[PDB]
Every structure is written in C-alpha cells, then in structure tokens.
Amino acid sequence: LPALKLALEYIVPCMNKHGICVVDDFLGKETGQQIGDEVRALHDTGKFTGDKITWIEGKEPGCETIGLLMSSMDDLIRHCNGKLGSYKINGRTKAMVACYPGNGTGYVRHVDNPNGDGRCVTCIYYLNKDWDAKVSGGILRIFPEGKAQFADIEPKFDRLLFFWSDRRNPHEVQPAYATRYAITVWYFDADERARAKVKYLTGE
C-alpha cells in the first residue's frame, strides 16, 4: 500500500483497536541493508593501538539512509493526522540507534513513558538481515493492559513496529545469542509534552 492507504486502512484502526501495529517489508531489502551498513559503521568502529546507544538526527554524514527511514516513519505518522486516539502528534525524538549484545541478556519488563513525559507512540525498525528469532532470540513480548492475551513480536528484517508508549504496553525483550540492531523513535503528543516541559528553567 502507499503511505496514505497504509496509514488510514491499517495503522490507524490497528492502533485504536490493539495499541500494537506491525508493518512488514517497510523499506525493502536494498534500503534495509544500506541502513544496516550505516548502523554498523556507527557502532562497529575499531580500536587504536549493557548496550550501545547513539541518537541520530538524520543529516549526519554517513547517516543519510537512517534519515530516509525517519522521513518514511514521519510520512506514515503525518497521514494518521489526528486519528491516533486523541493525540496531536507535533514532533518526535531523534532516532535511537541501538546495538544489543548477543550475550544471553534480556531486557526487564518496563513501560516507555510511565509518568506523562510526552511520548505517545513508540516506533521500532529492525534491520538485522535474515534474523531467525527461533534460533537467535531477541523476541519482544508486549502485555497490553487488561487484555487476556500478550503478543510476541519477532525482530524481523525490515519490520516496523508501532505501539502506545504509555502504561498500556509494558514490554520485555528475551535474550539473544547474536549481535542485533534496532532503531527506535518516539512521537510526542503536543499537550502532554508541553505540560511535561513547564517544570524546566528554559532547559527543555
């Protein structure tokens, strides 16, 4: 589907019904591999003589295709104009470009935004080519609040994931046995983000 059709026919009704939406084959193989090359360049540096996080705006040298990813995410969110709950999405974070070690470590269950920090939608893009979660792990488990079911989401290559960032979606990540990368972006609700910012002295 084109971005308009995908947003209105799939992403919007999926998010309002479930709070979780998976889009597969988001950018295609060639672009996905290019993003992987850029991400590995950021994190796979050598040496002279937890996890790794970098925050990317999208116009840094060697990050142009990460920027294309962010523009593509922005395109989908824009076409959701005012249809994602009651939110008015007026901005987002930088891209969190993460490298997660394959050392048998998982991520404890948590809520991204538990206390009204302004973030209403979490977007995650998975860029590890030919990742087989059945063999290598790394599955995301989301527990939508009050539902009888929970969801396991495999970090499949070129997969885009949306979910509500607030207490509706506690989530945990199972351990993995190879290095993997994911890029996360959070979209802000205008009113909540404004309220969260009033406490600061001109300091964001």
Ligand X SMILES: Oc1c(-n2ccnn2)cnn1-c1cc(N2CCOCC2)ncn1
- Piece of 11-19, 57-65, 68-76, 104-112 that binds Cl ion (CB under 5 A): 104-112
Report the DSSP beta bridge partners of residue 23. Answer: 160
Q: Does 131 bind ligand X (CB under 6 A)?
A: no
Tell me the β-bridge partners of 153: 140
- Residue 100 engages ligand X in binding (rule: CB under 6 A): yes
Between the CA of residue 63 and those of 116, 133, 158, what are the distances in Å? 31, 27, 17
| Of residues 77, 76, 57, the one with CA closest to residue 66 | 57
Closest distance to Mn ion from the beta carbon of 107 (Å): 7
Select 159 or 193, whichever has its Cβ closest to Cl ion: 193
Choose among 194, 186, 181: nearest CA to 169. Answer: 186
Single residue of 1, 53, 167, 197 touching ligand X by CB under 6 A? 53
Can you give the binding site for Mn ion, defined by CB under 5 A? 112
Q: Which residue is nearest to ligand X (CB)?
A: 173
Give the residue with the Cβ less far from Cl ion, 24 or 57. Answer: 57
The verdict on 110 binding Cl ion (CB under 5 A) reads: yes
**98 near ligand X (CB under 6 A):** yes
- Min CB(77)–Mn ion separation in Å: 18
Work out whether 3 is an interface residue with ligand X (CB under 6 A).
no
Instruction: Collapse the DSSP code of 157 into the 3-class scheme (helix H, G, I; strand E, B; otherwise coil) and give the result.
Output: coil
Counting Cβ atoms within 10 Å, is residue 97 exposed (0-12), middle (13-18) or buried (19+)? buried
Nearest approach in angstroms of CB 170 to ligand X is 11
The pairing of strands 180-189 and 119-126 is antiparallel
122: Cα separation from own chain's centroid:
5
Site for ligand X, rule CB under 6 A:
53, 98, 100, 107, 112, 173, 182
